[PDB]
């Protein structure tokens, strides 16, 4: 029985490999062998947002391209105003070990989580006039890696216990649980239509999930170590992965196959964060050697370098109109580049 | 304009209030020392926590020595894999490593864990305070026992007690020889790498003892002394 199961599994794996081999038709470089190089990209620091005490672990942009939220290991959550570098709110946290933060699209709620395995929601528009805790969500058996808002009443969470979950904030209950990874899940990103989402784990694999039914449709491999960043292309038909083997890759969902790999001989350090631009031509990544690289996705040749951080870069973000790039690092500073 | 200037002045007053609060919080924050506790299940790592009378899955203890506040953490609500959440503890003052020296069939795993911690990229500038617990059990095991440290370590038949060792008032020389052999095993891999950027402090402890917080306090004083020697151009 067990031997039959193993033989059957190997046979279906062979059939899947043959189908993928047949479906492959050409290379991305051959189709992209006529476009012009993007040109040298030069960016400078425009604002230096200072005020934190310890290393910054995450950040998120509000849906106005003006407001911002930052999370630090000192145990604070500061809401900035990028235009005037003015602090709006400073929320203390019960647990200092925070690993993620989010900003609701409406702008009335802010969520956070970390090593306490609990997701906390805070309200920004209160009649009394202070930010106060609104709801604590519990049920995960491992540290929280990422959390994203769908609506004002739903949220998606990923844990280090190899699971993802969908919540209902009003009643504080779980509606669907997604399982199937072997290692810890490190990041997730929602589709533009908020109906599918992808997640990368520490087993050198990524998976696509459908929010409603609660099943896995596609699984992607190709890396040789942990994946620690993921993001969605601005059209919802591809995504990008950064791993601990000092490489980046691009995956597509309608071909179920890897498309392009960015790497260099000198680079021997991993990738911590990955984000795209508005058009989909620039890929921004941060590395353990204290700097960020700007790759041209179509040509896969490095075209920009962002330097100025004195320690490891941990978080990267881009506005919803494409007017700024925010980078945080372990030197307790946040920098805006244009 | 009118409303623009009004909202701007309200914004600056709010910003200055927040900045004052942040200055106070920094004042409070920069005067507390953080420590990370590590060990195994058989080791009595929580036992020393309760031995110190002060005493979600994260156990936090606050104690105080000579008007200096220490905050210790124990992460015990996760899975076995720990190569991802340990990177959070990179700015910690020290790592307290507890070792079960009474048993032998699991000493090699403690050696491997210590060596893995020692050679990390984000933990190569953090000092480790080593506590070899369960000395009293070791005394009984070595004295009248059938198990031999020769079988697990075939290099124990050629090692003599170093001169600098200071025996206890009354103690079998064989007990001292073996108990210092374990320490030499742990210190051999701790001095074969590094450029004097971090040190290892060993101590012998039992299941009922009191002067442990003072040991950690003295080690923290030495660590800060080294950092200040580097900082104040006095090297």
């Amino acid at each position: 029985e067990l031997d039959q199961l193993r033989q059957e599994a190997e046979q279906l794996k062979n059939q899947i490999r043959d189908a993928r081999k047949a479906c492959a038709d050409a290379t991305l470089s051959q189709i992209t062998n006529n476009i012009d190089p993007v040109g040298r990209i030069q960016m400078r620091t425009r604002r230096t947002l200072r005020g934190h005490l310890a290393k910054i672990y995450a950040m998120h942009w509000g849906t106005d391209s003006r407001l911002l939220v930052s999370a630090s290991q000192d145990g604070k959550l500061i809401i900035w105003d990028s235009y005037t570098t003015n602090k709006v709110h400073a929320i203390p946290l019960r647990s200092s070990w925070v690993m993620t933060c989010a900003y609701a699209p409406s702008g009335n709620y802010v969520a956070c989580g970390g090593l306490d395995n609990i997701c906390s929601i805070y309200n920004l528009k209160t009649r009394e006039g202070n930010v106060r805790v609104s709801r604590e969500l519990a049920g995960h058996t491992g540290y929280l890696s990422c959390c994203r808002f769908l609506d004002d009443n739903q949220i998606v969470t990923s844990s280090g216990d190899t699971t993802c979950a969908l919540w209902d904030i009003e009643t504080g209950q779980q509606t669907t649980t997604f399982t199937g990874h072997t290692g810890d899940v490190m990041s997730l990103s929602l589709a533009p239509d908020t109906r599918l989402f992808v997640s990368g784990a520490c087993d050198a694999s990524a998976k696509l999930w459908d929010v409603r039914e609660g099943m896995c449709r596609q699984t992607f491999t190709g890396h040789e170590s942990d994946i620690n960043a993921i993001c969605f292309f601005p059209n919802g038909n591809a995504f990008a992965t950064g791993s601990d083997d000092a490489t980046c890759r691009l995956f597509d969902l309608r071909a179920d196959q890897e498309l392009m790999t960015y790497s260099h001989d000198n680079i021997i350090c991993g990738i911590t964060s990955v984000s795209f631009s508005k058009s989909g031509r620039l890929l921004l990544a941060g590395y353990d050697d204290f700097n960020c690289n700007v790759w041209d996705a179509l040509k896969a040749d490095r075209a920009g370098v962002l330097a100025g951080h004195d320690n490891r870069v941990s978080c990267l973000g881009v506005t919803d109109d494409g007017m700024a790039v925010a980078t945080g690092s372990w030197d307790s500073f946040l920098k805006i580049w244009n | 304009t009118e409303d623009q200037r009004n909202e701007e002045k309200a914004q600056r007053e709010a910003n200055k209030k927040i900045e004052k609060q942040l200055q106070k919080d920094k004042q409070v924050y920069r005067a507390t020392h953080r420590l990370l506790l590590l060990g195994a299940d058989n080791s009595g790592k929580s036992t020393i926590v309760k031995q110190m009378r002060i005493l979600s899955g994260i156990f936090e203890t606050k104690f105080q020595v000579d008007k200096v506040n220490f905050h210790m953490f124990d992460v015990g609500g996760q899975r076995d894999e720990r190569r991802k959440w340990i990177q959070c503890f990179n700015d910690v003052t020290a790592i307290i490593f507890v070792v079960d020296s009474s048993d032998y069939n699991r000493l090699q795993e403690a050696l491997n864990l210590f060596k893995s911690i020692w050679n990390n990229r984000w933990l190569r500038t953090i000092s480790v305070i080593l506590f070899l617990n369960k000395q009293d059990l070791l005394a009984e095991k070595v004295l009248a026992g059938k198990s031999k440290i020769e079988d697990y370590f075939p290099e124990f038949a050629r090692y003599t007690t170093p001169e600098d060792a200071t025996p206890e008032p009354g103690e079998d020389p064989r007990v001292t020889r073996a108990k210092y052999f374990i320490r030499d095993e742990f210190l051999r891999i701790s001095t074969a790498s590094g450029d004097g950027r971090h040190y290892c402090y060993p101590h012998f402890t039992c299941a009922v003892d009191t002067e442990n917080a003072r040991r950690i306090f003295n080690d923290c004083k030495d660590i800060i002394l080294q950092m200040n020697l580097r900082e104040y151009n006095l090297v």
Partner: nanobody, 126 residues
Framework: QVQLQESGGGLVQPGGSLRLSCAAS????????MNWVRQAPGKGLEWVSD????????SYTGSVKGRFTISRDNAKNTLYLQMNSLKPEDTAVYYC?????????????????????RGQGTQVTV
């Protein structure tokens, strides 16, 4: 897809000889440290021996210090373990394990209950 498969093993008598050969695929073979682990009936996972990238530093556990010898073959992407004087205490399942990260001198999780880059194993009986 990272893949590692063991081969060899079998049945022997006390005081015998064996050669366990581990084949690998899916990654560059000369940037990673390699280890040998085994688990016996009624026991948990335990560590035996390890070898570095080039093949200079070699580490053993004491109980097999004078008997077994490790080797790596970068050209053929293979790992080898050589057996000698098999005392009736080695009957187990043997896994060849990879360090999680390249260009790295420490292996954190190799003996975990669940680990991604670990083989299926082969059974040796003495």
């Amino acid at each position: 897809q990272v893949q590692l498969q063991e081969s060899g093993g079998g049945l022997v008598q006390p005081g015998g000889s064996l050669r366990l050969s581990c084949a690998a695929s899916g990654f560059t073979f000369s940037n990673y440290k390699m280890n040998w682990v085994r688990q016996a009936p009624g026991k948990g996972l335990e560590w035996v021996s390890d070898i570095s990238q080039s093949g200079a530093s070699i580490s053993y556990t004491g109980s097999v210090k004078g008997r077994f010898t490790i080797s790596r073959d970068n050209a053929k992407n293979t790992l080898y373990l050589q057996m000698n004087s098999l005392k009736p205490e080695d009957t187990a399942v043997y896994y060849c394990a990879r360090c999680p990260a390249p260009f790295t001198r420490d292996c954190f999780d190799v003996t975990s209950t669940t680990y991604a880059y670990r083989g299926q194993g082969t059974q040796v009986t003495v």
